[PDB]
Design a protein around this ligand. Structure first.
Ligand SMILES: COC[C@H]1CCCN1C(=O)c1cc(C)cc(C(=O)N[C@@H](Cc2cc(F)cc(F)c2)[C@H](O)[C@H]2CN(S(=O)(=O)c3cccc(C)c3)CCN2)c1
Ligand SMILES: COC[C@H]1CCCN1C(=O)c1cc(C)cc(C(=O)N[C@@H](Cc2cc(F)cc(F)c2)[C@H](O)[C@H]2CN(S(=O)(=O)c3cccc(C)c3)CCN2)c1
Lengths: 389, 390
């Protein structure tokens, strides 16, 4: 019911990622690790890097075991080269257990570490199927559950501030909670609705309908999941398949037409600013994503506000204006429900029952007139046809 | 060949540098000078040093003029301290002119002079912007052009032997040509392709694409010129920015994977040897560097062989094996197209038209199956974006 020891154990923000503290080796080497539900490798910087002020020093760990094998891991954003091995790992603000897990010691990288993010590694929480080099390299969460009694489930509450957080602020602020092995009821309001995990590789789900301010985008639902739809804390934006993205932007533009913005804004590249406190939230539409339910021909929906899809950023002039970037972008690899979307909800990755739960987050940003929502049920047919093959 | 007097006026090798003979003072004092397109100061040993068997003696020159000013000049490799002055300078196997130029008389140095190199000074041929102490100290070539009718251009043909040269051999062998004021057609084959000199300080260029055996390295082209790319005869290796180096080595290892080499080899530190005549050139890939062309959206490429990037060295046991060191290394100061790269081509430093020309060298080392090349044109867009801006 409650896991006080794990509540508020996350820090960070949508644009730089959310991270949890972990320790590797003996004696314990503390490192901040990016929580990534969109990959399956546990890797840490293991050599000096301009953006790192600390890294994993294998020669100083008595429990380090060298697997005598290198691995090359590229992501959409960047990539790293690492040396595989194992060591004892713990989560200070997590379950009171120690696990021997696989660790990729990063020796070379390109556009992977983020300057000023405060994290030095990544925690891939997805399934073995997409682990590199292959599925024989057991993911951290799998080792955790196998070696301990911790229930096969974790939940994430990512908290966007709603405004820019400067360097010192983001280091001192609570970014959210990662409850390992349970669900903490204080992190959400209303009811939890579950959508099935279609297949166990990414946390894959199926979107069956999309609305912009109640208006049906009206596309073949297969387009929404081409070539897949995933829940990914390791990606900032809500990324949509090319065809869906173009349709969504046209609709969002139509709904917010009382004000015109440069193309660069809609490309998610340039920011838009308004005098302090005057952001016209009301001219932007809410976005509803209907997800397949656990009951036959039943679906539910999660609704996102512009407070979620417009990401706060500090103005180039550090002025007092409230500025933002459009956090919805085009994808060529399916739908990616990133951090800005997760920030509106408490998300339960129920691996044990092969499902993902959504509930209104106790820390989501909104205004006096609208709120994010998770509602159901709705009658929906042939939802399995929405999945891509 | 329209400049027979300057053809074959160079001696030396990639590992110790190529030098030209010059005279300074009245009466003329002969000295061997390192040809360095990577710096802009003309300086000579002017005091006894263990590695010098001769040096500039100012008190014996009636035309020596003291500028009453000292200067400290450090390079990545080493450094020297000297006293500035001017004197009359000539190049015996060069244009038939005498010019008064600035000369830094080296009185102290650290890791600058090389034992057995046979040179006693350095000729910085780059622009005034990087001259020490500042750009008011006119570089030698600028003085030469201003005081004479020599065209504002020089060309270099650096000739690597393709095998080790002992002390005696390196002293009697022709190391190449420095044509002052012109282009000698006998030093190259095929056509000359020109890339723009981006800015006049180092001889800076812009690389727009890189291939290893035709396979695109596929990096943002800005990486190739971070923070700059230069043509430098004063450096042995092809030096590449950290990330480009890592990518290049990975690809070169992949292409030559039928043979495994120790990390020390790829670090450019230890040599690898093969039984005489059996070097497996064919397992190593050719490397192509695409350079911005003179025409809009057009580029050309220069391709080098392992015969260029594997530098011949004498075996530690002076055996009959053919040994080499990997002559590609990482840099934290941008790309450096060093001597091992220049050895594959005839390079024209066309200062007058702010461009650098490349053509297959008549003396590049190759085998019966592959040759170095300079080919074009290729359609390339947004090349200006490949250049780096601080
Ligand atoms: C919070 O976000 C922070 C800001 C700043 C920097 C990145 N970033 C983004 O918003 C952003 C944007 C885009 C367009 C992509 C990514 C992206 O690749 N994320 C990765 C994790 C990651 C986070 C980083 F911080 C840097 C980095 F190198 C990578 C995630 O694991 C993606 C990976 N892919 S896969 O097909 O490659 C892929 C598939 C299967 C296995 C692997 C190993 C990779 C699938 C979806 N899950 C992140
Ligand atoms: C053939 O090579 C022979 C073998 C044996 C010994 C050196 N060497 C190399 O291969 C080698 C290696 C490395 C890593 C560096 C150098 C290097 O500094 N070369 C210098 C010239 C030089 C040659 C020597 F022989 C000894 C020596 F002291 C220096 C060149 O002018 C470099 C200098 N820089 S700057 O930023 O410093 C620099 C920038 C602007 C002004 C100055 C004054 C210095 C820019 C690129 N142009 C040479």
């Amino acid at each position: 019911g409650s896991f006080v020891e794990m509540v508020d154990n996350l820090r960070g923000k949508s644009g730089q990622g959310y991270y949890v503290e972990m320790t590797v080796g003996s004696p314990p080497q503390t490192l901040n690790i990016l929580v990534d539900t969109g990959s399956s490798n546990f890797a840490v910087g293991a050599a000096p890097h301009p953006f790192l002020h600390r890294y994993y020093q294998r020669q100083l760990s008595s429990t380090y075991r060298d697997l005598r094998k290198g691995v090359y891991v590229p992501y959409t954003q960047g990539k790293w080269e690492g040396e595989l091995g194992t060591d004892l790992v713990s989560i200070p603000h997590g379950p009171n257990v120690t696990v021997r897990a696989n660790i990729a010691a990063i020796t070379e990288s390109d556009k992977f570490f983020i300057n000023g993010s405060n994290w030095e590694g990544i925690l891939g929480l997805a399934y073995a199927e997409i682990a590199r080099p292959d599925d024989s390299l057991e993911p951290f969460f799998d080792s955790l559950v196998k070696q301990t009694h911790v229930p096969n489930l974790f939940s994430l509450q990512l908290c966007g501030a709603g405004f820019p957080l400067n360097q010192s602020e983001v280091l001192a602020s609570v970014g959210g909670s990662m409850i390992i092995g349970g669900i903490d009821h204080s992190l959400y309001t209303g009811s939890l609705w579950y959508t099935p995990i279609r297949r166990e590789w990414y946390y894959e789900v199926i979107i069956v309908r999309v609305e912009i301010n109640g208006q049906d985008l009206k596309m073949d639902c297969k387009e929404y999941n081409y070539d897949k739809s995933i829940v990914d804390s390791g990606t900032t934006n809500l990324r949509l398949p090319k065809k869906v993205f173009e349709a969504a932007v046209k609709s969002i533009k139509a709904a917010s037409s009382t004000e015109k913005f440069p193309d660069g804004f809609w490309l998610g590249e340039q920011l838009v600013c308004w005098q302090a406190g005057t952001t016209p939230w009301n001219i932007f539409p809410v976005i509803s994503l209907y997800l397949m339910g656990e009951v036959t021909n039943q679906s539910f929906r999660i609704t996102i506000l512009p407070q979620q899809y417009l990401r706060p950023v500090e103005d180039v002039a550090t002025s007092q204006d409230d500025c933002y970037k459009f956090a919805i972008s085009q994808s060529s690899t399916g739908t990616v429900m990133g951090a800005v979307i997760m920030e509106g909800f408490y998300v339960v990755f129920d691996r044990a029952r092969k499902r993902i739960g959504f509930a209104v987050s106790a820390c989501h940003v909104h205004d006096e007139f609208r709120t994010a929502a998770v509602e159901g049920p709705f009658v929906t047919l042939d939802m399995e046809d929405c999945g891509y093959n």
